[PDB]
Amino acid sequence: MQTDTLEYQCDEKPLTVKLNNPRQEVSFVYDNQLLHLKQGISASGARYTDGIYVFWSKGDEATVYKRDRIVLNNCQLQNPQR
C-alpha cells in the first residue's frame, strides 16, 4: 500500500503530496500540516482543490495558488510513485 507522492523537495517548499492512487485526492502540505484537496472539473490541468488552496497539476508541473496566497508556483515533478 503506497501513496503516490510528488517531488517533495522543491527549491522553495516541500511538495509532499499524497496522491491517492485513483488520483481522486491529494493530501497536501500547507507547511507541516496536511489538508485534502480533490480533483474536480479540470480544464487547465488537473485541479485538486479544497478551498484552502487551489492545487493545479499540469501533469508534470505542480503549482498551488489561492487567490491571495500561493504556496508553491514552481515544482516540476521528477515523477511520482508512478
UniProtKB/Swiss-Prot annotation:
Protein localization: Cell outer membrane
Keyword DNA repair: no
Superkingdom of the organism of origin: Bacteria
Keywords: Cell outer membrane, Disulfide bond, Lipoprotein, Membrane, Palmitate, Signal
GO MF: lysozyme inhibitor activity
Disulfide bond positions: 10-75
Any one GO cellular component localisation term in the record: cell outer membrane
Main location, first listed in the record: membrane
Bilayer topology annotation: Lipid-anchor
Site positions per UniProt: Directly involved in lysozyme active site inhibition: 44, 58
Assembly description: Monomer.
Family: Belongs to the MliC family. Type 1 subfamily.
Purpose of the protein: Specifically inhibits C-type lysozymes.
Protein name per Swiss-Prot or TrEMBL: Membrane-bound lysozyme inhibitor of C-type lysozyme
Species per Swiss-Prot/TrEMBL record: Escherichia coli (strain K12)
Lineage of the species this protein comes from: Bacteria, Pseudomonadati, Pseudomonadota, Gammaproteobacteria, Enterobacterales
Chain's gene name: mliC
Section covered of the full-length record: 28 to 109 of 109
